[PDB]
From a paper:
Based on the patterns of cysteines involved in the formation of disulfide bonds, teleost fish type I IFNs can be classified into two subgroups, one containing two cysteine residues (group I) and one containing four cysteine residues (group II), and can be further divided into seven phylogenetic groups, namely, IFNa–f and IFNh. However, despite a high sequence diversity, all type I IFNs share a similar structure consisting of 6 alpha helices (A–F) that are arranged in unique up-up-down-down topology. Functional studies have shown that CRFB1 pairs with CRFB5 to form a receptor complex that interacts with group I IFNs, while the CRFB2/CRFB5 form a heterodimeric receptor that is activated by group II type I IFNs.
The crystal structure of CiIFNa was determined at 1.58 Å resolution with space group C121 by molecular replacement. The helix F is straight, which is the hallmark of type I ifn. One disulfide bond formed by Cys3-Cys99 is present in the CiIFNa, linking the N terminal region with helix D, and is analogous to the disulfides found in other vertebrates’ type I ifn. The structure of CiIFNa was compared with that of known type I and III members including human ifn-α2, ifn-β, ifn-w, and ifn-λ and zebrafish IFNφ1 and IFNφ2 by superimposition analysis. It is apparent that CiIFNa has the most structure similarity with zebrafish IFNφ1 (fish group I type I) with an root mean square deviation (RMSD) value of 0.879. Notably, no helix element is present in the AB loop of CiIFNa. The Arg35hIFNw or Arg33hIFNα2 in the AB loop contributes greatly to the interaction with IFNAR2 and is substituted by glycine in the CiIFNa. In the present study, we showed that CiIFNa (group I) interacts with not only CRFB1 and CRFB5 but also CRFB2, indicating that it engages with all three receptors for signaling. Furthermore, mutation of Leu27, Glu103, Lys117, and His165 markedly decreased the phosphorylation of signal transducer and activator of transcription (STAT) 1a induced by CiIFNa in the Epithelioma papulosum cyprini (EPC) cells, and Glu103 was shown to be required for the CiIFNa-activated antiviral activity.
Residue numbers in the entry: 2 to 160
The structure:
Amino acid sequence: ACEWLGRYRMISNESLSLLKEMGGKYPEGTKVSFPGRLYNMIDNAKVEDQVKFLVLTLDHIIRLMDAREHMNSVQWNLQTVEHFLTVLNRQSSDLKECVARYQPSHKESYEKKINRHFKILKKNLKKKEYSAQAWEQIRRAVKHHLQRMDIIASIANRR
């Protein structure tokens, strides 16, 4: 089995504590559209698809948040942003070892759905010229992603 699914929750708890610690309470108007129905579907998916979904989603969060030259407007402590991303990169690398044992797939509707969501988050971030509000919207969405990802990992680990 994928040995890292047992370790995923402790490292997830660390990632969420870093996301909280790096900055303060949200500015006004941080609620944005979130793919709850997609996560309910993945909760019910095969382990293989759960783990592939976790890797796709981790890499998307990393690629959305690792352009630090676009973070001049945030009050976040960038040392803690860098620590956060280092932890997610560890999660992704470790789960990719599990994905390597699967037959590769690129036509799953979950991959298209999560790509579209992350394209929307990036578009709205650029439209708001990387404002503190725009980044806090992404911070709130990412917190929710990571909470639902920990539940997926737990469901995969207990099969």
